[PDB]
Subunit: 92 residues, 3 copies
């Protein structure tokens, strides 16, 4: 079970286990994701990953809030972006 | 394990790996990342299979075989902003 | 399975995973599409680039400043990938 799908609509892939990495466990961090819509503008308010801003990411099919796009605030950081996804919002 | 997906024509050139496959919501494999491809021309939305993306022809850098297309998002709110759609028959699963 | 590739010096800091490895064309340098926990030092240079058409930028562990390798950035838009990491294999430790 490599595919990680939206738990709400069940059929929509958001990421795969192949994309998981460890920046430092409610929040999965992946390099890549799909089938997400970004809501609003980035914010640093209470960012869990200092030096990154977050943007709400919802399932493009059912609007379930799956997590956030994290965007680097400085060009010297790696990666420049990633996804922090709520593990309970994904199947498996 | 045949993890490496190589250009079937020149055989030696890796284009992607099974690690990069994803499922966008089928003759065409979609991967987040690929290598050893040259882009031909400028992006086009004409008859795009993935609405909201433009396509650019992608050929093997070694033998110029047409492997597939780079897909590039037309809007900032889409994820991913880019991916590759590769013709499955243009690739050889290689254990290396 | 040791999927995680960590900085050998500070041991606990993940830099990449085996999932991100690809083959551009050697023994010494691992090429991966994605990495984390690296700081870029200075500006890109093509001087003695091992990967013709790419510039290199020194990449050091953000925790202990160990020189792990380089960010490679494409000098032409038609190349794929547009960036990757070339990491000295001996600077990394396979971990969980
Ligand atoms: C409800 N809620 C939430 O889940 N966050 C996440 C957003 C992502 C992150 O990095 N850190 C947070 O605390 C909020 C941040 C500010 C205000 C309200 C917030
Ligand atoms: C020969 N040919 C082709 O293969 N396509 C692909 C390009 C990729 C895609 O998304 N959709 C297509 O129909 C064409 C699109 C327009 C005109 C001619 C085309
Ligand atoms: C000490 N040193 C080094 O390791 N390199 C690498 C940088 C990465 C690459 O592609 N090629 C190299 O020769 C140098 C390149 C120029 C001058 C001094 C260099
Ligand atoms: Zn959904
Ligand atoms: Zn070829
Ligand atoms: Zn370190």
């Amino acid at each position: 079970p490599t595919s990680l799908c939206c738990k709400q609509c069940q059929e929509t892939e958001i990421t795969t286990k192949n994309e998981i990495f460890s920046l430092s466990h409610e929040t999965l961090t992946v390099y890549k994701a799909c089938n997400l819509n970004l809501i609003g503008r980035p914010s640093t308010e209470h960012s869990w990953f200092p030096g990154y801003a977050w943007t709400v990411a919802q399932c493009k099919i059912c609007a379930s809030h799956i997590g956030w796009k994290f965007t680097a605030t400085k060009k010297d950081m790696s990666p420049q972006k990633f996804w922090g996804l709520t593990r309970s919002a994904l199947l498996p």
